[PDB]
Design an enzyme around this catalytic site. Structure first.
Site, short mmCIF file in Angstrom:
data_model
loop_
_atom_site.label_atom_id
_atom_site.label_comp_id
_atom_site.label_asym_id
_atom_site.label_seq_id
_atom_site.Cartn_x
_atom_site.Cartn_y
_atom_site.Cartn_z
N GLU B 351 0.95 -1.17 -0.03
CA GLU B 351 -0.02 0.04 -0.03
C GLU B 351 0.70 1.19 0.15
OE1 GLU B 351 -0.24 -2.04 2.71
OE2 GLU B 351 -1.87 -3.51 2.03
N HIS B 481 -15.90 -11.54 -2.13
CA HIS B 481 -15.73 -10.70 -3.42
C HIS B 481 -16.33 -11.19 -4.67
CE1 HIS B 481 -12.08 -12.21 -0.85
NE2 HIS B 481 -11.78 -10.70 -0.85
#
Ligand SMILES: *[C@@H]1O[C@H](CO)[C@@H](O)[C@H](O)[C@H]1NC(C)=O
Ligand SMILES: *[C@@H]1O[C@H](CO)[C@@H](O)[C@H](O)[C@H]1NC(C)=O
Ligand SMILES: [Zn+2]
EC number: 3.4.17.23
Lengths: 97, 591
Positions: B351, B481
């Protein structure tokens, strides 16, 4: 100077202009409220689609980047007109013996 | 001529996006750091107007055309403007769709699996790691999918037909074509791509990796028979309850039972950083010098003073989720649930790696506020994360002493769990791609939807369920998902994109050693090529986004075998004392 002239509630008081159809020659101003003309269109007088009125405003934030920061730009200009000069600079040092 | 007036509306929409959409990202920046009950209210007030003002420009989007554009800079700048969505139909069936997704989310969030009754907490993966008895775990296994498979079956495929109705309005074949046809490319004669060719484009990528997989699948048959003798077929398939995960995409918990050499496990970083004094504030400073010594520009000064890196211990409700926040225009911020562990260290460059890709499109406006497509966004975040486990950086930082010499088998250990995390996950995910690429069309009928997902699992994956069930199960819908609004093909597209990015990782810094031990640092002349591919962004099509990287404009997974070139020649003399093949009739419940 973003530490002093801004707050978290929105410092959008400083306005700006993005675009216009013509090109302003320097050393004049315009506070003209002019309608966008794209082509075969009349003027209505109120905003809407294809009446993009150029009254804009920036997005001043105290944390808004380090390169996208407010730069208070002062452009100081010097003019001569083949006249006797009035504005003198900082003079030489004065000593006496 | 309104070509420059159509250009005028683009940066006119961004100026009402640098103050509307940027605070709505800043409000969402405020919430997952600070969770109060009034912070969610201006979250919902900003995020709804985030969509509604984007719906306000969708009313005026269809007044202009698309084929009256000649120059390629506005050719991709305007296709995101006319993306309407599902707004053409009325509120008869779209308002009912969100009432399906919330009751499918409450059962997945507040789900209880008991007759030892525990939530979908990390503890769900904790009995799968440590406990090995089946009789204490049989009721937790069958009762897991007894409360999910019967539940979410008659609500899932009414969510798919709504996007299949709206797909041809966006000139797409199905909802999979919204996931797979996002790689548009227009331009010259060699630039034009049509949509329906990725199905053949993905078949032969695994055709060159299937001899690597069955070389690795017969690797694991030797030693797991010593722990479960009466369950596993000898020269065939595998039961469904010994996968290291309930779906078999996380083969990380089983690694003490599939280690190559038991004499030396893998090296962690939790023992020696307690001695020199390098806590959680320290290596992130060396993580920034790892990001700027490769030619990439420096971090902002507000990244050092206005960021929250470490867990606030003031009674603060933190979500503890590693996520990269793209605010834009120099507001580069990060939050991560930071500790010193190895799984946090591999995502320490993930990230944080996204901000160096967020500065790639920091020059790019709001309509194109992502990568070159939806696939290269997650790939460059992971291109430095898999290289973060390079051992030559771990010896040079000073954790191991200098007399510790790394053997030939020391590389083989962590590349195996690297193979079990992504390369072992591809035979599970690639059949899930052709799952949704054929159930969305309709060649397979109504009441045979159970067995065909299992038929894809017996033939390709080799995983057989050990208990007989009925047709009304939704085990492929057991992922959140897959069930909710998330794209899962971006997980597989993340692999095959950064598999070719590790090729250009070699010639950029002039590398010649083993490709899996790559470290791009100690070289500043690598960066003159790294600023060439990231400066284009989404403004150019994806057929040009591969050309400046490698030079070839085709999908090639031959650098994957170049990434594990000491692992292939080692694997030939291991599992040759077995017969290769597949038997699609073996079942454990044949009573
Ligand atoms: C969260 O609250 C603390 C204490 O009030 C404050 O210091 C911090 O700035 C807040 N977070 C954000 C993102 O404003
Ligand atoms: C890079 O330089 C540092 C400092 O001189 C050194 O410790 C390290 O071993 C070098 N890395 C390589 C791969 O030579
Ligand atoms: Zn990722």
């Amino acid at each position: 100077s973003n530490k002093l002239d801004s707050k978290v509630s929105g410092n959008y008081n400083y306005l700006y202009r993005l675009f216009r159809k013509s090109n302003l020659k320097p050393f004049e101003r315009d506070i003209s409220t002019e309608i966008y003309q794209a082509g075969n269109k009349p003027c209505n007088g109120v905003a809407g689609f294809n009446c993009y009125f150029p009254l804009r405003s920036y997005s001043f934030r105290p944390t808004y980047g380090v390169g996208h920061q407010p730069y208070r730009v002062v452009v100081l200009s010097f003019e001569l007109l083949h006249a006797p000069a009035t504005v003198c600079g900082p003079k030489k040092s004065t000593n006496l013996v | 001529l309104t070509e420059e007036n159509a250009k005028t509306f683009l940066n006119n929409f961004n100026q009402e996006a640098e103050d509307l959409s940027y605070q709505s990202s800043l409000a969402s920046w405020n919430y997952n750091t600070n969770i109060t009950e009034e912070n969610a209210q201006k979250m919902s007030e900003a995020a709804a107007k985030w969509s509604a003002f984007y719906e306000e420009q969708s009313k005026t989007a269809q007044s202009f055309s698309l084929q009256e554009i000649q120059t390629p800079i506005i050719k991709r700048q305007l296709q995101a403007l006319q993306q309407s969505g599902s707004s053409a139909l009325s509120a008869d069936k779209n308002k009912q769709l969100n009432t399906i997704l919330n009751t499918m989310s409450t059962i997945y969030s507040t789900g209880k699996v008991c007759n030892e009754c525990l939530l979908l907490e990390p503890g769900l993966d904790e009995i799968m790691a440590t406990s090995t008895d089946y009789n204490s775990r049989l009721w937790a296994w069958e009762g897991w999918r007894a409360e999910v498979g019967k539940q979410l079956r008659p609500l899932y495929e009414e969510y798919v037909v709504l996007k299949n109705e709206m797909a041809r309005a966006n000139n797409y074949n199905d909802y999979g074509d919204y996931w797979r046809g996002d790689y548009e490319a227009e331009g010259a004669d060699g630039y034009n791509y049509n949509r329906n060719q990725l199905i053949e484009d993905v078949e032969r990528t695994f055709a060159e990796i299937k001899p690597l997989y069955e070389h690795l699948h017969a690797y694991v048959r030797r030693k797991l028979m010593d722990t479960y003798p009466s369950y596993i077929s000898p020269t065939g398939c595998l039961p469904a309850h010994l996968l290291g995960d309930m779906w078999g995409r996380f083969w990380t918990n089983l690694y003490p039972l599939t280690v190559p050499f038991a004499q030396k496990p893998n090296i962690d970083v939790t023992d020696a950083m307690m001695n020199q004094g390098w806590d959680a504030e320290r290596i992130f400073q060396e993580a920034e010098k790892f990001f700027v010594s490769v030619g990439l520009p420096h971090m902002t000064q507000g990244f050092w003073a206005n960021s929250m890196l470490t867990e606030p211990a003031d009674g603060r409700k933190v979500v503890c989720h590693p996520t990269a926040w793209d605010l834009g225009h120099g507001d580069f911020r990060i939050k991560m649930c930071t500790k010193v562990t190895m799984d946090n260290f591999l995502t320490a460059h993930h990230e944080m790696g996204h901000i160096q890709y967020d500065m790639a499109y920091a020059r790019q406006p709001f309509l194109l506020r992502n990568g070159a497509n939806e696939g290269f966004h997650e790939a460059v975040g992971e291109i430095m994360s898999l290289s973060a486990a390079t051992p030559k950086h771990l010896k040079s930082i000073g954790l191991l002493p200098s007399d510790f010499q790394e053997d030939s088998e020391t590389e083989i250990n962590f590349l195996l769990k690297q193979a079990l995390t992504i390369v072992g996950t591809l035979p599970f995910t690639y059949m899930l791609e052709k799952w949704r690429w054929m159930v969305f069309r309709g060649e397979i009928p109504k009441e045979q939807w159970m067995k065909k997902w299992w038929e894809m699992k017996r033939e390709i994956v080799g995983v057989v369920e050990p208990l007989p069930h009925d047709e009304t199960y939704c085990d492929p819908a057991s992922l959140f998902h897959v069930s909710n609004d998330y794209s899962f093909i971006r997980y597989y597209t993340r692999t095959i994109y950064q598999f070719q990015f590790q090729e250009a990782l070699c010639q950029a810094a002039k590398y010649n050693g083993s490709l899996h031990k790559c470290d791009i640092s100690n070289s500043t002349e690598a960066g003159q090529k790294l600023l060439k591919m990231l400066s284009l962004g989404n403004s150019e099509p994806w057929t040009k986004a591969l050309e400046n990287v490698v030079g070839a404009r085709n999908m090639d997974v031959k650098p994957l075998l170049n990434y594990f070139q000491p692992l292939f020649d080692w694997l030939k003399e291991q599992n040759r004392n077995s017969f290769v093949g597949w038997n699609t009739e073996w079942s454990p419940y044949a009573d």
